[PDB]
């Protein structure tokens, strides 16, 4: 299947409260595996998955030195942006970056990412062609011009097609067994009183991994869309996810409704109803 290596980077200025806070977070196929956090005396790149612990001291050293370098580049970038937008020196600002590669089953690069945001808004992004930039506004056009002359796209293309692809392979040899983890949802229906002759049926999906899931309610072979309540998928905090979908139904008609649970760990979707306890 397809695989990805992406770094989510954040630099947050805090005028008077100290130096900007800098973070580098690595993800292999949506799972955090490494982290650098500047908010420390001797800050260091750290493993966030046990399969990364096997990398030797030279690896951790190189990544730490490189992250401290990037940190210093973003500290300058924060001052450069205040100028570009004509902002005062005493307000807190954010720079965020998503950088990385998506590779297919055949090892070829599917997508390269180099996306910047300033104060939570698109700033500049490398286009799919890996040759041109999309500047969101006037300030980003200054960056686009500078990077066009310096041949930045070409330098990034070399990283995305080379280093990124190659390092994703290395990380996958280490983490693949753990990364392919699939925990099927365990589902149950709860019953709750409503005013008058109505009741709520809440269909629960628990202990599942990955987070992608679909819960539906059916009545007379048709999926209920309007009047169906749901919660956004949420972490249990132990590595698994939770979700629920509920519907308001007539009292006495609980057995006419079926909940369906769709997940990658489910060859057959779960079908369940309200089961009144003994």
């Amino acid at each position: 299947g397809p695989h990805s290596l992406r770094y989510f980077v954040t630099a947050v200025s805090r005028p008077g409260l100290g130096e900007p806070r800098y973070m580098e977070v690595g993800y292999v196929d949506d799972t955090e595996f490494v982290r650098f956090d500047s908010d420390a005396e001797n800050p260091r790149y750290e493993p966030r998955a046990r399969w990364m612990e096997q990398e030797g001291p030279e690896y951790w050293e190189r990544e730490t030195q490189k992250a401290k370098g990037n940190e210093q580049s973003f500290r300058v970038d924060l001052r450069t942006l205040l100028g570009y937008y004509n902002q005062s020196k005493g307000g807190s600002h954010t720079i965020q970056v998503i950088s990385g590669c998506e590779v297919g089953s055949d090892g070829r690069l599917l997508r390269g990412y180099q996306q910047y945001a300033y104060d939570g808004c698109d700033y500049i992004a490398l286009n799919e062609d890996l040759k041109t930039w999309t500047a969101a506004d006037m300030a980003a056009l200054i960056t686009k011009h500078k990077w066009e002359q310096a041949g930045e796209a070409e330098r990034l293309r070399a990283y995305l097609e080379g280093t990124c692809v190659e390092w994703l392979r290395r990380y996958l040899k280490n983490g693949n067994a753990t990364l392919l983890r699939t925990d099927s949802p365990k589902a149950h229906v709860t019953h709750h009183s409503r005013p008058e002759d109505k009741v709520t049926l809440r269909c629960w999906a628990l202990g599942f991994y990955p987070a992608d899931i679909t819960l539906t309610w059916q009545l007379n072979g048709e999926e209920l869309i309007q009047d169906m309540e749901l919660v956004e998928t949420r972490p249990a905090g132990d590595g698994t996810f939770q979700k629920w979908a509920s519907v308001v139904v007539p009292l006495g008609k609980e057995q006419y409704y079926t909940c369906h649970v769709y997940h990658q760990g489910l060859p057959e979707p779960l079908t369940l109803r309200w089961e009144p306890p003994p």
């Binding site: 770094y7 990544e63 490189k66 450069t80 990124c164």
Partner: peptide, 8 residues
């Protein structure tokens, strides 16, 4: 391995 970012 993270890229070495260029200044904006």
């Amino acid at each position: 391995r993270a890229v070495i970012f260029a200044n904006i």
